Design a protein around this ligand. Structure first.
Ligand SMILES: C=C1[C@@H]2CC[C@H]3[C@]4(C)C[C@H](O[C@@H]5O[C@H](CO)[C@@H](OS(=O)(=O)O)[C@H](OS(=O)(=O)O)[C@H]5OC(=O)CC(C)C)CC(C(=O)O)(C(=O)O)[C@H]4CC[C@]3(C2)[C@H]1O
Length: 286
């Protein structure tokens, strides 16, 4: 029944995309609010933004009043598409990389280092095909009417390639990869430590997710702000250079802009994926 297995894997893959699509679409408005607050200083420099966002509520109000309600899903297609090339790469190469750099968990230290190498390589290899979509997501979520900078998703690609080339599409690759490693190490480290300590299960997952993402957030900020420099006259000479200039100009706190908005996005995604699981449990067997 190899053919039946092939059909099973095919249905599992496609329906997985649907689950991911709904989850990301549901928490899409809060996601754009995060991206707006996070890269507002870049917009102010570019002249796209008039005044700094006073907060999450202020971001919601201004965006809704100036652009509308549908504008909160601007860039969402990138998140929808990104599933298939990611998971295809996931199901193909992730296990081999784990078999290449991994050590049996039954020493913790050697397993920890192995997980970083495996997670880093898998993340980087996936980003080679994926990163362009995340870039377009951020840029579409960023450009606003004061006269939009980009007409659409594919418009981003055309204008970025015409100005910077393929390099412009991969702005902030290094701090993204490092971010993946740091996030993963923090995730697994925190999870195993709090493991011996369902509502309890859901709360546990939220704590680890919040902690790991918060500490690795400055890396995410630098990544997104480097995406903003694509097609612009002035650009940072690296993530470290970007990091240095941010602190010297706006302070350390500027690296954590939109962090709280990101936490809200997390509980929204986790929330709606649980709801859909129950809905899926009723319609389909699994
Ligand atoms: C610098 C940063 C900050 C820290 C690292 C990343 C993630 C958190 C990194 C996170 O990275 C995820 O971490 C998970 C837990 O370790 C890991 O799961 S696990 O391996 O099974 O344990 C995922 O691997 S995967 O094979 O299932 O897909 C991995 O996603 C990827 O590696 C795919 C890449 C295309 C990203 C994915 C992601 C997420 O929020 O979940 C995502 O892309 O949605 C990132 C958001 C952006 C930042 C935020 C990046 O800007």
């Amino acid at each position: 029944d190899a053919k039946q297995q092939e059909t099973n894997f095919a249905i599992n893959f496609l329906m997985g995309g649907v689950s991911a699509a709904i989850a990301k679409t549901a928490a899409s408005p809060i996601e754009r609010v995060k991206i707006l607050i996070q890269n507002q200083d870049e917009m102010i420099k570019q002249g796209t933004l008039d005044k700094k966002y006073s907060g999450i509520v202020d971001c919601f109000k201004r965006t809704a009043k100036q652009e509308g309600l549908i504008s909160f899903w601007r860039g969402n297609t990138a998140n929808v598409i990104r599933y298939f090339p990611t998971q295809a790469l996931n199901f193909a190469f992730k296990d081999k990389i784990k078999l290449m750099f991994g050590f049996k968990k039954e020493g913790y230290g050697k397993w920890f280092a192995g997980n970083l190498a495996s997670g880093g390589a898998a993340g980087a290899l996936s980003l080679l095909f994926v990163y362009s979509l995340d870039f377009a997501r951020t840029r579409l979520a960023a450009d606003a009417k004061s006269a939009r900078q980009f007409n659409g998703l594919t418009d981003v690609y055309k204008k970025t390639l015409k100005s910077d080339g393929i390099a412009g599409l991969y702005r902030g690759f290094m701090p993204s990869v490092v971010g993946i490693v740091v996030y993963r190490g923090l995730y697994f480290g925190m999870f195993d430590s709090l493991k011996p300590l369902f509502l309890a299960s859901f709360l546990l997952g939220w704590v680890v997710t919040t902690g790991a993402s918060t500490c690795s957030y400055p890396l995410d900020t630098v990544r997104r702000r480097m995406m903003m420099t694509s097609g612009q006259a002035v650009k940072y000479n690296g993530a470290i250079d970007c990091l240095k200039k941010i602190v010297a100009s706006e302070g350390v706190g500027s690296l954590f802009k939109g962090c709280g908005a990101n936490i809200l996005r997390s509980v929204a995604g986790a929330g709606v994926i649980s709801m859909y699981d129950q809905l899926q449990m009723i319609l389909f067997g699994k």
